[PDB]
């Protein structure tokens, strides 16, 4: 046993140096908490050192605040709750250990959002992730488990029909140009270059058992075995978020149904909602957003604050690990736990509209300056 | 006695609540049939409540309907025929109570099948199950009966020689080395984890009297006292399905002959063929299939349809085989009752050969429409 060897050393000699680190894990992990949890392990053998490695290796990130830790299996969140609970509370605006997560996958509860200004919104996307109970998560899953997961996913998705009928495209089976085309077109996950993906062990055996399934129009897609067992995605050009979300809920429900038929269930509990690798993706694990052109807003003052006020996050055109190019920003809901899928999409819709108005505060004749403070 | 107690309650007080159930048993068990059959029992004491317990415990799924009942002895099918007959008819595509099942274990009747293209067929296999008359089935057999069955099996199997010379491995005394080898060879079975099997009572006293026997060449395998008294499997790499089926037939014949010399025989009758625990396994209880490479066809939208038309079904795989090929499948006959063992193996042989033709067409980037078969 390796952990057994490490346990021969006093806890202080193994405690990581997080002095110049800026991630959620670093903000919570103390010498005391490390000494208390370093001897524990989940049934699959995942340990605290495994949980925090990415956060030790990556002091920060150039575009967003990172969590700095991952779960290796469903039991990770329980065995190491004294580490995860505070992180979750911080990352998800005060979500406490005693709080409950609520789901709402009914499109009808989303007001408007069916016509975000086309001149500003180039495309709308809604995604989430799901883990199959009984298997270890990507940071820890063996080649055998990953292949088993791929087998089940492929089997299940082959049942989707109608507008959701599609095909599975194994990473290994596509040419270099085919892969890059899908990536650049915003459909497929990038090559394993993410500092998180690398340091957490999620890039092992790449591209074995990884792939993408999608319908003919590429408006509904499922990533298999990338950062999570499954990443369910609904997307299309334009700003009809309502339509995107409706298709999302429909396909997501049909997928769970298919899995249940085979007696498989997604990792889920009343407190954390759906369980995923990264604590930031718990609850709904939902990220709804748009590629929005705001060449001046992205430059304007306190833009970072307007997004913070609306619980929104910004990413590059190529995603979280990229910068915005041509003034096109990736704007989506920053929160995922403590709000329902419907409430989340509603925040993006309402937030975008504002961003647009704030976007039109110069080309015509206006600008924030008068009615602003007076916080109430 | 206990049944006498229940008979003191009105039938509707003992009637199971199958409001949210989706299994064959639930479909046919009306309040009237329950009241008509709840007072009956077989000579071994098996009652209707015993027959349907697993179906009451396991609701099944709308999309995938389970059987929901089991036979506890040979008489169960007769005593509770008013339950089983409709279930059998529905499950086996219209097999009527008056239909006859023809058994054909003569390899000479199989046309060809000795040359399935080895560039596609990685291995061939034929599996079945048998029950020994005079003993209750797994859900109901006592420790004594189970041990008696094991002793008979071990004795007969130890008599096999030459190509069928083998060794017996009791689960009880199994070492770590033996189980790992058995695991690597895909020969091991463990205590069931399926609630459908557990709820029937078939896993009692595990692993008492359970065992694994296989010949030295590892082309003939027998499981003792698992789902049924005996599960017989013949296999080998390549596409010589005729050879596999021939070994299958010879092994079964010799075993049966050894049993007869001791005044024992397999449960069998002109209507249901070989009697087994689950109604879905009646008739031949045979599954003949191939591990086959079909990377192109496997991605074709008409793949599931072609298999359906050929009266075949598939299962994806999770090994290095499909990983390297990008599509290896387990394809076998779908029918069990109303077709002889020969007709069933013939359908796999004929179907496979067409699948290979379609695969070769797709390799040439051609269409397979002209090869599409009509439902048979
Ligand atoms: N609103 C959007 N419209 C079109 N593509 C998008 C949108 N948001 C993100 N993407 C695509 O998703 C990728 C980045 O995904 P991130 O890494 O941002 O996904 P994460 O949302 O997985 O769950 C990028 O390559 C980009 O092409
Ligand atoms: Mg991503």
Curated annotation (Swiss-Prot), chains A, B:
User: At which residues is Phosphotyrosine found?
Assistant: 120
Q: Which residues bind creatine?
A: 67, 227, 280
Q: Assign the protein's first listed, main location to one coarse class.
A: cytoplasm
Positions of post-translational Phosphothreonine modification: 30, 317
What's noted about post-translational modification?
Ubiquitinated by the ECS(ASB9) complex, leading to its degradation by the proteasome.
The UniProt record lists the keyword Transferase:
yes
Pfam families referenced in this protein's UniProt entry, alphabetically: ATP-gua_Ptrans, ATP-gua_PtransN
Q: Give every Phosphagen kinase C-terminal domain span.
A: 120-362
PTM 3'-nitrotyrosine: list the residues. Answer: 264
Q: What residue spans carry the region label Internal MTS-like signal?
A: 125-133
Q: Where in the cell is it found?
A: Cytoplasm, Cytosol; Mitochondrion; Cell membrane
User: Do you know which PANTHER family this protein is assigned to?
Assistant: ARGININE OR CREATINE KINASE, CREATINE KINASE B-TYPE
| Name the record gives this protein | Creatine kinase B-type
């Amino acid at each position: 046993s390796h952990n057994a060897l490490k346990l021969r050393f006093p806890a202080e000699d193994e405690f990581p140096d997080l002095s110049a680190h800026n991630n959620h894990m670093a903000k919570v992990l103390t010498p005391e908490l490390y000494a208390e949890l370093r001897a524990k392990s989940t049934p699959s053998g995942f340990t605290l050192d495994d949980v925090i490695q990415t956060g030790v290796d990556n002091p920060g990130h150039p575009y967003i605040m990172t969590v700095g830790c991952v779960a290796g299996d469903e039991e990770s969140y329980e065995v190491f709750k004294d580490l995860f609970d505070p992180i979750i509370e911080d990352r998800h605006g005060g979500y406490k250990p005693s709080d409950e997560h609520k789901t709402d996958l009914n499109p009808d509860n989303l007001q408007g959002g069916d016509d975000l200004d086309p001149n500003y919104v180039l495309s709308s996307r809604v995604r989430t992730g799901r883990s199959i109970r009984g298997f270890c998560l990507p940071p820890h899953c063996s080649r055998g488990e990953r292949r088993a997961i791929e087998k089940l996913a492929v089997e299940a998705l082959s049942s989707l029909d109608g507008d959701l009928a599609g095909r599975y495209y194994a990473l290994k089976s596509m040419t270099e140009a085919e892969q890059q085309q899908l990536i650049d077109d915003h459909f497929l996950f990038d090559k394993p270059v993410s500092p998180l993906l690398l340091a957490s062990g999620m890039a092992r055996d790449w591209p074995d058992a990884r792939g993408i399934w999608h319908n003919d129009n590429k408006t509904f897609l499922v990533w298999v075995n990338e950062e999570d067992h499954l990443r369910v995605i609904s997307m299309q050009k334009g700003g009809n978020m309502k339509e995107v979300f409706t298709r999302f809920c429909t396909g997501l429900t049909q997928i769970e149904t298919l899995f249940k038929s085979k007696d498989y269930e997604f990792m889920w509990n009343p407190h954390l909602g759906y369980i995923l690798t990264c604590p930031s993706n718990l609850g709904t694990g939902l990220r709804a957003g748009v590629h929005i052109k705001l060449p001046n807003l992205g430059k304007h003052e306190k833009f970072s604050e307007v997004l913070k006020r609306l619980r929104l996050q910004k990413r590059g055109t190529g995603g979280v690990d990229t910068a915005a190019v041509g003034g096109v920003f990736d704007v989506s809901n920053a929160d995922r736990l403590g709000f329902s899928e419907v409430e989340l999409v509603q925040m993006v819709v309402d937030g975008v509209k504002l961003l647009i108005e704030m976007e039109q505060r110069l080309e015509q004749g206006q600008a924030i300056d008068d009615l602003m403070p007076a916080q109430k």
